[PDB]
Design a protein around this nucleic acid. Sequence first.
RNA 1: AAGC
RNA 2: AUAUAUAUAUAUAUAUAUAUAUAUAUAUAUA
RNA 3: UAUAUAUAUAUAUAUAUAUAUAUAUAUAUAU
Lengths: 50, 50, 50, 77, 149, 150, 80, 681, 158
Amino acid sequence: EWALTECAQGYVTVTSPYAPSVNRLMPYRISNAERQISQIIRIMNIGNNA
Amino acid sequence: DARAITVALLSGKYPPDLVTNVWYADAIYPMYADTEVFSNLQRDMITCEA
Amino acid sequence: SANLFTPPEVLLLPIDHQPANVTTPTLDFTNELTNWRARVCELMKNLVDN
Amino acid sequence: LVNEHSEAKDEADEATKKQAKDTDKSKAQVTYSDTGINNANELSRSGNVDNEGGSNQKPMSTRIAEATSAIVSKHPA
Amino acid sequence: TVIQPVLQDISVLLQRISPLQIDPTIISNTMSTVSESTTQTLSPASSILGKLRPSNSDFSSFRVALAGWLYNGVVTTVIDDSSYPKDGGSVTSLENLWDFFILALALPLTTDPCAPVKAFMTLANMMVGFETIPMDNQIYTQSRRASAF
Amino acid sequence: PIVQVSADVENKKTAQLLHADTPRLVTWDAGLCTSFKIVPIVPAQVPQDVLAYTFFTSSYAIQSPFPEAAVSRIVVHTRWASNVDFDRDSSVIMAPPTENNIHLFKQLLNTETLSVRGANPLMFRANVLHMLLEFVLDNLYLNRHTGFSQ
Amino acid sequence: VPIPQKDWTGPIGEIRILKDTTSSIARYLYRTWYLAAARMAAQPRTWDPLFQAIMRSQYVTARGGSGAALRESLYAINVS
Amino acid sequence: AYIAVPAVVDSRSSEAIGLLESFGVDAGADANDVSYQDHDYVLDQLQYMLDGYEAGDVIDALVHKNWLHHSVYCLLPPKSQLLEYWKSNPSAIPDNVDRRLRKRLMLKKDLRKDDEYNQLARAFKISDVYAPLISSTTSPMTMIQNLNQGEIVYTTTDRVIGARILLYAPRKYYASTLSFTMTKCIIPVPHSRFNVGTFPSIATPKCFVMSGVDIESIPNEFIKLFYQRVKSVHANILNDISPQIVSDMINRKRLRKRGASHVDVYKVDVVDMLFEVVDVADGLRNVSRKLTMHTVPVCILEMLGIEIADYCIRQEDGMLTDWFLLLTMLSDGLTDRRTHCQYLINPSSVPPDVILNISITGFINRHTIDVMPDIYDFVKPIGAVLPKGSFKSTIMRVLDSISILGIQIMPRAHVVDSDEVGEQMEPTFEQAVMEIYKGIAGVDSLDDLIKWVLNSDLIPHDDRLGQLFQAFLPLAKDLLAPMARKFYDNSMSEGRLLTFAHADSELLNANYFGHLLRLKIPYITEVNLMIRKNREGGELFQLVLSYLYKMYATSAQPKWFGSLLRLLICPWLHMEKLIGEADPASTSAEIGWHIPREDGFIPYVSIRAPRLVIEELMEKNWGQYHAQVIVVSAKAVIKGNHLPVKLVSRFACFTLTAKYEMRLGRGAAYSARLAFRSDLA
Amino acid sequence: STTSGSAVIEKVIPLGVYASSPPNQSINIDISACDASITWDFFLSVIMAAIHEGVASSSIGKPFMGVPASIVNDESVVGVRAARPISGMQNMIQHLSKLYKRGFSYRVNDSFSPGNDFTHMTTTFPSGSTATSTEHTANNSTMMETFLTVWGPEHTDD
RNA sequence: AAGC
RNA sequence: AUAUAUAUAUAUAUAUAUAUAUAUAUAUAUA
RNA sequence: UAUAUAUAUAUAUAUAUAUAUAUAUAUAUAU
């Protein structure tokens, strides 16, 4: 919710529960290096093509 | 096209009664229910892994 | 952050950004592009009167 | 065999429905669901889990059935 | 489902024992005023009546609210988010002002421990762009929804 | 025959760029986390003229954790006991050594090999590497908690 | 001299995409029509409702159109 | 509990048909445990929505719908009509309205030139009264969220999705809306422990989804796209379950004929067949390859006994057995399970890639598909195009020996061979092709031509075959085409026939009339030639001929041959399970050309169906179609238009071909209309 | 390419008078039975594919002429068989491709011959449609350019 | 039946 | 003041269709 | 003899649509 609030520049409010949870698994966080590698690969695809 | 961009620069109007913090709160709200970004993150991870 | 040649979080623009301080906009002529249009019009006016 | 979160939500809907009937109105004035609070982490007791914390997708008796059926030996040839 | 009958039944008991009578026409007749025709249709006296809708004669919400006090430790009474102004609202809208009035005047009756904060923030939300306050958190802004507190 | 094709017309880079398929990361396995299977090779010498049949355990129809045979061996068989929801479709399975297993080592570059019973030794390393990669890939699962009984 | 059968992709409904490795002269015809379609579809006037209305009205004339065959063709699926 | 299956589901119909066990889920005791939701109208709304939005975002929004929560739209009229509606019967005005407007609406005066009501109306909008509104500028996600909480959602447009649509004020007020899809009139359901719906939703952490991974196997286009998108976006948050799992969770505490209605016969169940090519050339074995067969109907598998065991597919002769031909003939090709490329079968016993013994392993997919090829608008003669070396004789022989229900479908007399046009000329086409060689420099004999065109590996040089085509094409287009035209013209006279050809361009250039089908085979056709001994000009000549025809063919994707045999057989075999016991006199019918002067009648179509179906057929306008009959060996010709297929039924499996003959004298050309001369009973 | 009618006034007289005048020389080229020479074998199978592909980008998810969008099966890539949304123009292209592949069904009623009426299956391109002349001109120009650029230079040595 |  | 045409409001009558309930007849299944 | 499903005929209740008639108000034309 912090990320979503930040990315919307405060125009959207979202909420999260505040209580003992049951250990959900949400694998979405990766290092910047992987993002840069994927970005470079993606650039090389569109290389010189409109 | 230069003509089109000039037309855009010359003929812009706002809704008759605009309040930005309400307009954006109303417009942006649906678009942060999209979970495509996280999927892209997982795809990016697999790319470097491969 | 997938930025490569720019710092993370940073997004460049070819126009100077100046955050609005009101939520009820009204017409105003203190802008870069307004000045550009005014200068162009004045140049044409000088050209005609030569 | 329904999810605890689902039951907490499903039970909320039924309570709201009977509220409307009790006050002879289509839309209930007071509701137990669709409130402001993000009560997502709520759990309700359900028949999906047993007392050992295991999944009740197979009943206790049947699990005991397979368990002790593998130890039996028959009269020799 | 276990709780619902208990609260509802007590609420009916209170209604059929209290000497108090709820007569919405007290609001209606005491207005008895209306703006003229040539000017714009929006008028404050007419606008508030539409928000109140005196014709409707259901008050279970009031009756239940009293019963909620006896079971604070198991049931928390709150104001439904639909009662808050649309998209946070603004002080520039005559309609949104009445939403603030109705909501602010009714909050003290709920058992919500965070009621005062909600009563405060909902005005701040409407006030964005005219009046600014300092915020400690760099994530949360003044535009945070009030019902989230 | 098997000589293949690689050239592909790829005008649909736009579809890739606008939307990419998500990988299947999380999968659940409810079976045994094993890939090695013990198999009988030669049936046991029962009954026999030395020991009476009343001695042997099999004669009482008792289940055994291990095969009751004259000879038994270990064979790799990925997910031979698993119970998964999504299949990764990369199983590595051999047969008992009394049964031929040549076809596993001629799967990669033996496009020139004529006989069905033969394989080229010079691609043994490549075939082995491919086999190991598939072995790893087929086992990417998360163990699942089912339930117990006293 | 026909186009070799080994120079086509899988079907997309009814159509079949032509590969770019083809030794036939059809490749230039395909390229020309490709660029023509791309330039056509990018014109904003294509999406203007009036343009589409004009195109629809173009073939609405007081001349024959074999309406009878249309009639039994529609009756073949029980539409009156 | 919610389970989504990759098929269209309806509340009343899908229950009568065994939809769950059309997939494989047993669900023995009903006990009113399984419930179905109607999703057809949702599919129609999706199709309508596709006219203003992208498919992807519509699907993404629709996924978040909770199907266990009840809500519905409420279509409203345009504003101007809404006010005038409130003027009539001023008893429906909501209390939220401005009191000035309400007082003015009850004025009972015409309000034509009030000049104060005008301003009030002008400064009025629907959103002032109804909180949740959709005004054709709303993202589908917003609509889905609005239906997720709340029972009534107000809208001013009909282009909405997710639930039913009710009407506000009577139809007279709605003038812009014309669609009659599901708009319920002004006139106004619980959930079982399990619920089955076509769509899969993520509104709950445990809304289950059927197997649904066989995306290619989904028949319907829209459902296929929906499932593909859903798994391509939310692959990691889905609860995939198998039919066995569904059977367990339905029959956990309990385990320890579709009633009576109209039955369609063009819905068949098919399965994927998994097997391997075990080689037992010695006492040991091999696991050479693992292959899959795709579209094998269950009816065939149950008809001819198929267990899972070590089957051998060759006889003492050395060629393949008949049942294996039929089985491979009814499918949609093979596929290797290691490399996912297509697979083709070597018929001959030539060392490279021989198949002698196979072993079945299991059956994975199961779903019901329609059999109607959908290019069957009118009952017309059928022309099938197969390449040379396609077991034509074997297929013809096998088909002829099928006498399922006393009708002997597809007799040898009702099929015409491809080569039949060849011997119409005293010098057949083949010897002209042989003599072509004289027109080529450097070639002095047909043998010289063969060694010139091939490169010692039975491959055309891809250039010399060029001049072979150069010389051959004029021969075909100048000699074969006209004689073929006359041959087909006469052939249509005797009645409906099955026609075989080698390249579709033959039929196109001959102006052939009837349904045109291009079919391929899961075999190597070229190898089928040179093993076939007793050839006239040598086998290599036949190879060259086959190459010439393949080059002669057009550019069009040939479907699998099974798509024809399935339609030819499966409906009849299914119907035998229902009609196999009843009295044939009642459950039989006949359609034919009537000619008044006992009475002249020549059969056209043979119909077999239950009594109710035949009785329903009895009252149809068979007199609408006319033909000219001439004369036992009679023959006729149709004028006007041919018979539409739906006139027969989606029931009442019939005969695809017929031969014209008069049952027991001057030659006459009187007239004809067809009559339902079926039977009295 | 011109668009003039058969009235003598509206044509390009200057073109002809310039072409005939020496030292310029003119070549007169005509296509015999032009409508009968354009079938699915070579032309239609290519033009239909090209038009269908060269429109998806600038037109995704939009109706046209009353024709809506739809979903079709995809098999271009080997192995993978999927579904694919198409625009209104692509729907029209799919249907028109069906029609072109099948052929044409001509109905005849010979008024000068009693008993001469039937249906003739043909592959000849229609003459009464609105796309006849423009399509014929486009293919004429394209084939001429292809000859002048690629085939012709590669087939003569003088 | 009788086009663009 | 009278006649004709157009628009709005109210009342009454008639016809048709769809849904639910009751009665009788025919066909099939179960006891 | 009882129960269930389908079809047909009659009656009651609800909704929609069309037509006719009467009265009142406004506008135009004629005496």
